[model samples]
Target chain A: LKIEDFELHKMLGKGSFGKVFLAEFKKTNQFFAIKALKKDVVLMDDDVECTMVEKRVLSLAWEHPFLTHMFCTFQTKENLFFVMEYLNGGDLMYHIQSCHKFDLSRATFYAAEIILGLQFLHSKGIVYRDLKLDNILLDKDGHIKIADFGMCKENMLGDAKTNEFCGTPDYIAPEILLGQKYNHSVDWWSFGVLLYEMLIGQSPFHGQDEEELFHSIRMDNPFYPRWLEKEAKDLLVKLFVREPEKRLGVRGDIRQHPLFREINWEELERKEIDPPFRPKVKSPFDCSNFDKEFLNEKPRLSFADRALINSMDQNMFRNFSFMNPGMERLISH
Target chain B: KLKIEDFELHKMLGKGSFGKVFLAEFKKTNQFFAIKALKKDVVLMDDDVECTMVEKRVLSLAWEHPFLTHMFCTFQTKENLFFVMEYLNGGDLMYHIQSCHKFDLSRATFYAAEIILGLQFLHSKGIVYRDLKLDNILLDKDGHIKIADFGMCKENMLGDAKTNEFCGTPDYIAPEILLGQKYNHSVDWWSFGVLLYEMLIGQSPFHGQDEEELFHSIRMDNPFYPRWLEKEAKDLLVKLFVREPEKRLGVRGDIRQHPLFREINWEELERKEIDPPFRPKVKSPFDCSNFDKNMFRNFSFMNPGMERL
Candidate 1:
């Protein structure tokens, strides 16, 4: 209804448009992370359409168990507010920074949940263009809730191909880097990068800068560690295939790989299987797992340039407000 | 997910502390609505953020009641918060009160009875209608009342919980509130008495040179009962005007059963079966004559949706 309905406690994270704050809805007293994006900045960046697409994707993603839940969306004169379920377990990037790499069981469990999330998104004709450690967040239960859909490509159903040059450098697919037409298969390549980073503590393809990194991604073969498990190394080899159609996820259901032989797809889909690790969250409002660089900053909405905001056509943001029907049902009961 | 572009804005209906209320029609269905647009900067500058949220929460919860204004939905733009409500074309009670000077016994009784049900519903929902005045009560095309403006309401006052906010219009504020005493929903009953007395007598029962004197009078003075006042009306006012909240009529016992409402079929009233005393002389669903007209001469604006990405 208004920005004041939620008590913004601490800054959870930040991005190009704005910052995400850990907020508490005063009416329900439920903890949520409110992503406040500056209107001028979004407009200046020419991301108005992209922002709406992200909202649509976020709204649709809630039906899946492993995707981040968006409670609702509201806007103010200065910014747009997206109210989402607060995942206190922190992000995979934060955990990766501390642990350097995950053990076999932990990495397997996270990868399993991520596969389900990606499957659901692809089923809905959505491609998560930005799939990486930072965007993969863990819930208090340690189950992954895929976060941030800003770079998602929508309506990419079977045989549909898009050629948008977008995504994180480390996770960018070879097809995307080469400006080749691609489909949801590109996400599989990024997924490979994510899984590799989780197990190997670094990206499979890297260089001194983005130019060299792109060159490595397009040409070089990753060296597998001698100590790596035979099945893990085998999975990585198939996922890193340069050809999109021959990639592990593109060729068939990657869930059948030997590395994930212990995963029961049906049970994993319903979250029936217990996770190998859970975040040590003291309370629902806990921010212990978030990066201190963001947490140390005060959580407050910045004043927008009123003149510039007014000059822009406000009608561009029409139909922006949304209320998740599932959230409303829970509130009513 | 209602947006400003979907609705075709007409003339301005009224102006508020934060923004203007516009008469709008949904482009697809041709259904009328009253859109209250509140400026974001004004709300934040006034530090009414919590109050604004409370108003929305209350309005969203008030849909089930017949006498409470129903909010269809709420949305926002870069600069405003929009509350799309059912268009009550008959104008607010304050406008009608000024037009008629004072209402007859039967007319006032009808309004008071309907307001009672509205207050009852809110109280049952653990809410206290802190601001209950003629200005905030609106009349529909059929003349029935719809209580509006929830910015001053205090919620979660269930059971024995109390809130001691020193807020309310000076004329209608309860003595207990003025005295800074922790009070519950009974404060509404006191304000109800003040409103009823004004409706019948054509003027406020308590008056002074300033807020201090006015508050003093409310704390120490008794309303002068006019000779023409009926016995039932006098009895109800007396019970509602008790300074001690514990002895108040609505708090201590049922005010609905008082002699003033002896002829009222509450069940029928709740179901909206009883006929109202007057219906608004509206020309069409888009009529804005009932509202003040001087404020809208130069106001013209439109939102034509979005054309480009």
Candidate 2:
């Protein structure tokens, strides 16, 4: 497509790795997000990687309702552009940081959506190395759309584990923290951690130091708040077990979980009901308005005070870099 | 081959690459008309000729509506493609918005409400306009908006409406299209928000200093509310700009009757009684003193129909 085909409307988002743009499809009169990654940097850098990984992960989620959708890719002489889904409510981190805590119904609705997404990914042999609020976004009716899968892997059964240690400090699983072999089970650990964090605005296993944090997670004795109801506490304890094998024992039979018995899977799929958690979405594309040159010229945005607005809208991000795939590289990124 | 006299060109008004827009005096009645002159070769030889052809088909298929530009007739010369359309001496919508600088929420809502009427009309005809920018929207003598520019249009009734092709302006693109998701008519609703924002704020809500920075901002979501807006206005926008198109304010079930537009008097807009949400300095040729040729600088387009300067 010629650069003139789309008149850039605004700046959508930017990380140290690259930037995202909101552009108008001059012909079809459509609005799309054009994620522009510097060609030289994105193509050459092993950490940032090319669009291959994202394409693989998004393709695997072809029909899933709980995942952000990727439609197509376009390019220019200077950048590789991934046309992306523009979620209305932004990232879940935006909600978490601003709202601080969530009620049960809202939490359950978002968690169920996340579980459905996780269950689908796990069934397809893909491991979502990062499963924090920051990575989750919201649709119009306020449902979770798990996003940013640059670190996900399609490791099949019995394959040798990869040594790529990644993820946010709080969400990293025990096996990953202990420098031991890990697989899809790590996702369950994240689910447990995410629920706990979302419930109280804090994680149960956070420590003063990395060693202490690693030790505490490996010990598998993180305490749950007494304020949590018996069912909530029981589910948390069951899912946060020391052995990944024992935790979330019903992964193969997801419907068996009592925590989700109240969920109406069919209605949820239809998006007919309000979620337990509702974000205050005031605009469609929150990123900067398109500079007159959004398609022709792009601008930088101030990335300050990253956090989540509720169960889905997020601002904080775990930078995707090779050396420290999580956020240690956020400074340099 | 058809020649200039086939349609009796009376005066020169405007010009594009292949043709000059003349005041066509239909030989039979001598009524005033806007004649677009273009080269048949230029449009035929272009790789993206589909956009032009689709425009012609969409315009022809449309039923006469108060809000749409009228197409009168077409006269083709050996080297030209001339189209005679309703002459709107009032000019385009952009000129109006620029002249007014900003519009009240109710007035903006009035325009949007009317545009939606025109939009639903086009959709019913199995067409997706795909090009509803301010510049393409024309105004009649009475100040009613006339949606124009059928270029890059498409028919949507074909099975599996997802087109592998990508074409749209940047800011108004729906997120689904941005993520490369297959799309349908919801995209126009998203552009409506951008257009409405420009009308009320005198600029779009999401803008950057340059193209790259602005693009990054779009991939990300964030919106600012001016302290001046009413709560009702904000609430309507929240519902209208819902990111997921399937769940937006216009989602089925008599959506237009929702509270957001309930207070809007449709008859007022249809009659332009509520007054325009905005106004232009030059409502017609009488309002325009000099045609800014400088703005059309280095203009290289196919103009085989008219004699060279």
lDDT of each model, Cα atoms only?
0.82, 0.63
Model 1, A59-172: lDDT tens per residue?
898789999988899887778988898899989888989999999889889888988899889989999998989888888889999988888889888779999799988989
Q: How good is model 1 by TM-score?
A: 0.52
Candidate 1, residues B1-309, lDDT tens digits: the string is 457898877666666573688776677544556789888788878888778778788887798899999887777777777888876666787777787899999999999999999999999999999889998898875679999999889989899999997988899999899889999999999999999998988899899999999999999999999899998998999988999999999999888888889999998898887879776553222223333322112122222221111
- Model 2 lDDT tens row, B106-211: 7677677778878877777767666667777777644567888776666874434645356667766666666677777777777776777777677775677875
Model 2 alpha-carbon miss at residue B65, Å? 71
Q: How many pairs in model 1 have backbone atoms within 3 A of each other, for residues 3 or more apart or on separate chains, i.e. clashes?
A: 1
DockQ of each: 0.01, 0.01
> Model 1 in CAPRI terms: which quality?
incorrect
lDDT of 1 at B8: 72
Q: How would you encode candidate 2's per-residue C-alpha lDDT over A202-222 as one tens digit per residue? A: 887767566787777777476
Model 1 spans > 4 angstroms off: A326-333, B1-309
Quote the positional error of residue A59 for candidate 2 in Å. 2.0
TM-scores of the models, in the order given? 0.52, 0.44
